[PDB]
Design a protein around this ligand. Structure first.
Ligand SMILES: C=CC1=C(C)c2cc3[nH]c(cc4nc(cc5[nH]c(cc1n2)c(C)c5C=C)C(C)=C4CCC(=O)O)c(CCC(=O)O)c3C
Ligand SMILES: [Fe+2]
Length: 452
């Protein structure tokens, strides 16, 4: 079959179609017009965007396709080097770091993180309880305060003390500015032009801020006992080679986990809360479960595992707006996709996750409605229909960490407050390689239930 491709602009090809602040949303509109697959070309790129479970199920076969670094991820390598996210599967440090850090995400490790996650969630609850009547909540801002602090405490035993700052943490400011530069570089066809020197200086300045914090984390540990993510990074030896991670890689892993370990979870919590105030029937049902299960002043690990409906609300927020909205793959050998599209070895594919999650063949005709009930029987969902955490061996290492923290936090919010969408907030999705509802604000009225 002849592959569909959107509008071309001479030698620029499809590049001007992504001349927007919201490229993922622009690609979803192209997908709606062209269907399950389209070719996308730009000066130094050729990729194919996949939107149907039918084709994605084939692309998710590990024997035929491996993780590829998209131009977006290639730009993030300047920040996260060969850390777990921005490394090729064949690079020595991928398997080495994967095997050394995987034990940090075990059930035993999770049970150990719980108390520190509760520490940060209590801080969020107390901030909101202490607001004056007129005051509102800047939701993404406060979700970022919680998620960054959780990964800092659980993973590195370092307190960012984000709730003791009225503006975002300086690490957040530099990170956002750096990731925005990396997303913009995709539309910058002539990067060596002297006119780009100012962006290059700023990019370098933001990377320094991030690295100064990594240095403080490292210094804190050697002066400080602990068996966390940082412990495994410094002392773990690869079972295959018998050697530990080098100093250069350890630094890349810290930056990686500080970014990956919070941005996506912050976006999820903000989206989940957005959908809850927009669907009051669902809020009531989730708040009912929170009150029924969280019978103690603080949630226990066991209680979080019983919050079924809260988990369904989180999956349904990840269905509509997967906060890491795309992942890239490459053909390991010459193959034919869906028995219609021949691919040569090395040919790139892009999985457009928000489109996959809108496939009417899988979900029904009500794809745009927020219905947690879709995840009541998770066995009924076909394989590779729901992919918020990626695929195969390169899937999210922090999936369980993220869902445990988001479940715990959302349930404590629903137990302690009643929420009001006082401005009738219109959804505005900001893209910075990840998604978030920009400008999302609420008013929270305390149910006056104490903590512990
Ligand atoms: C709602 C929360 C989250 C979402 C939607 C999420 C999504 C992802 N995380 C991925 C990879 C990853 N996620 C990772 C650690 C974290 N990720 C986390 C939370 C989330 N991670 C937390 C929390 C983490 C750490 C504590 C790392 C390190 C990788 C890289 C895994 C690898 O390739 O070995 C990928 C695969 C990307 C690719 O194929 O290029 C997706 C889509
Ligand atoms: Fe992840």
């Amino acid at each position: 079959k002849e592959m569909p491709q959107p509008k071309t602009f001479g030698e620029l090809k499809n590049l001007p179609l992504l001349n927007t602040d919201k490229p993922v949303q622009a690609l979803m509109k192209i997908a709606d017009e062209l269907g399950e697959i389209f070719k996308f070309e730009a000066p130094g790129l050729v990729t194919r965007y996949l939107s149907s479970q039918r084709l994605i199920k084939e692309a998710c076969d590990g024997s035929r396709f491996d993780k590829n670094l998209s131009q977006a991820l290639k730009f993030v390598r300047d920040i996260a080097g060969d850390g777990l996210v921005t490394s090729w599967t064949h690079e020595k440090n991928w398997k080495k770091a994967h095997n050394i850090l995987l034990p940090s995400f075990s059930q035993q490790a999770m049970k150990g993180y719980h108390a520190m996650m509760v520490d940060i969630a209590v801080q969020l609850v107390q901030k909101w309880e202490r607001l004056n009547a007129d005051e509102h909540i800047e939701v993404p801002g406060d979700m970022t305060r919680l998620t960054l602090d959780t990964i800092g405490l659980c993973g590195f035993n370092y307190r960012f003390n984000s709730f003791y700052r009225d503006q975002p943490h300086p690490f957040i400011t530099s990170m956002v500015r750096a990731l925005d530069e990396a997303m913009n570089k995709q539309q910058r066809a002539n990067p060596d032009d002297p006119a780009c020197d100012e962006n290059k200086r700023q990019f370098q300045e933001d990377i320094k801020v991030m690295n100064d914090l990594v240095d403080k984390i490292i210094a804190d540990r050697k002066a400080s006992q602990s068996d966390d993510l940082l412990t495994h990074m410094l002392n773990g030896k690869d079972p295959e080679t018998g050697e530990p991670l080098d100093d250069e890689n350890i630094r890349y892993q810290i930056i990686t986990f500080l970014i990956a370990g919070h941005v996506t979870t912050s976006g999820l919590l903000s989206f989940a809360l957005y959908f809850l105030v927009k669907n009051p029937y669902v809020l009531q049902k989730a708040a009912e479960e929170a009150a029924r299960v969280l019978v103690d002043p603080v949630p226990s690990y066991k209680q979080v595992k019983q919050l079924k409906y809260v988990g369904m609300v989180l999956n349904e927020a990840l269905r509509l707006w997967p906060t890491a909205p795309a992942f890239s793959l490459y053909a390991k050998e010459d193959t034919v996709l869906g028995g219609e599209y021949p691919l040569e070895k090395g040919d790139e594919l892009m999985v457009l996750i928000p489109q996959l999650h809108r496939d009417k063949t899988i979900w029904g005709d009500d794809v745009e409605e927020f219905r947690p009930e879709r995840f009541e029987n998770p066995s009924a969902i076909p394989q590779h229909a729901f992919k918020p955490f990626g695929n195969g061996q390169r899937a999210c290492i922090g999936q369980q960490f993220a869902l445990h923290e988001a479940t715990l936090v959302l349930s404590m919010m629903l137990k302690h407050f009643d929420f009001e969408d006082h401005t009738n907030y219109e959804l505005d999705i900001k893209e910075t390689l990840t998604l978030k509802p920009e400008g999302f604000v609420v008013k929270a009225k305390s149910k006056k239930i104490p903590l512990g």
